[PDB]
Amino acid sequence: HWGYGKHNGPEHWHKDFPIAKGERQSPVDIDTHTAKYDPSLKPLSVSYDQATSLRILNNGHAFNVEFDDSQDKAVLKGGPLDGTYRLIQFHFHWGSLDGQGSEHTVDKKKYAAELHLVHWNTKYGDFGKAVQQPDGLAVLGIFLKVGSAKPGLQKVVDVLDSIKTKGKSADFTNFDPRGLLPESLDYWTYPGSLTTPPLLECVTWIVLKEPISVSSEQVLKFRKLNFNGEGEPEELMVDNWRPAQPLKNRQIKASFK
Numbered sequence: 001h002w003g004y005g006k007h008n009g010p011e012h013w014h015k016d017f018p019i020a021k022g023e024r025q026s027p028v029d030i031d032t033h034t035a036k037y038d039p040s041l042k043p044l045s046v047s048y049d050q051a052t053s054l055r056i057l058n059n060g061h062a063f064n065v066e067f068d069d070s071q072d073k074a075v076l077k078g079g080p081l082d083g084t085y086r087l088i089q090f091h092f093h094w095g096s097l098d099g100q101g102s103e104h105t106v107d108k109k110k111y112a113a114e115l116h117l118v119h120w121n122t123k124y125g126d127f128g129k130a131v132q133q134p135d136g137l138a139v140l141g142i143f144l145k146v147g148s149a150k151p152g153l154q155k156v157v158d159v160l161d162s163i164k165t166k167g168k169s170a171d172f173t174n175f176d177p178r179g180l181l182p183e184s185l186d187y188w189t190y191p192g193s194l195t196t197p198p199l200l201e202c203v204t205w206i207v208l209k210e211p212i213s214v215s216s217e218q219v220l221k222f223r224k225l226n227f228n229g230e231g232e233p234e235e236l237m238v239d240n241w242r243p244a245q246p247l248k249n250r251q252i253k254a255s256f257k
């Protein structure tokens with residue numbers, strides 16, 4: 001179906017998913033001079049102490065670390081959000097080279113990669129109902145730059161060999177996603193969409209200002225993954241990012257002065 005190549009990449013997606021040309025698409029460029037500080041924005045509450053990771057899956061577009069979301073364990077609250085959003089999975093988008101890979105950009109600057117921690121609003125009961133609602137998801141986005149290693153990422157990098165190709169999964173219990181956060185939780189926020197088909201307009205985006213640093217060796221391991229299934233021709237999983245989309249009639253708000 002859809003993917004990231006010239007024949008099936010982002011510029012094609014609108015033919016099967018016409019919302020691609022919609023009014024609240026993601027990602028976007030964050031213009032730091034135009035985003036306005038909103039003193040009414042609350043601190044984010046990231047409550048991940050009770051997180052229960054279960055499995056890691058190569059789905060042919062990225063790899064997802066999945067959590068048990070059958071109760072209010074790992075949740076995101078506060079900031080621009082009303083109510084409680086449960087962590088369901090995280091994944092990354094990254095580049096073939098260090099100068100590209102993020103989906104959001106900051107003053108047109110691309111980072112090497114971007115982590116998305118995906119949460120759904122518990123008022124809608126299940127994830128499939130939530131993605132049908134304009135306030136159904138909250139995705140916490142964190143930029144990755146290349147520098148020092150991120151110790152809390154190494155457990156993820158070391159299992160990637162076992163899920164090299166599409167449809168492979170592995171047990172992945174006891175992973176603590178607090179080890180992927182930066183020091184500061186200052187953020188930008190705007191209403192947007194899923195960045196992969198079906199491109200549903202159901203996301204409150206919360207993008208942290210402070211990137212995390214990962215090492216060149218860590219990001220090199222992401223780039224050894226494959227988009228293809230086992231035995232099929234090898235296509236390295238790189239450049240699985242959607243470019244910035246028109247901001248249209250939206251305002252990006254900053255939590256910080």
Ligand SMILES: NS(=O)(=O)c1ccc(C(=O)NCC(F)(F)F)cc1
Pocket residue numbers: 116118131139193194195196197198
């Ligand atoms: N974080 S993100 O890249 O915008 C992103 C997060 C989640 C999903 C997702 O659950 N797609 C499967 C669904 F909902 F069945 F359509 C897609 C994109």
Ligand SMILES: [Zn+2]
Pocket residue numbers: 091092093116195
């Ligand atoms: Zn994503």
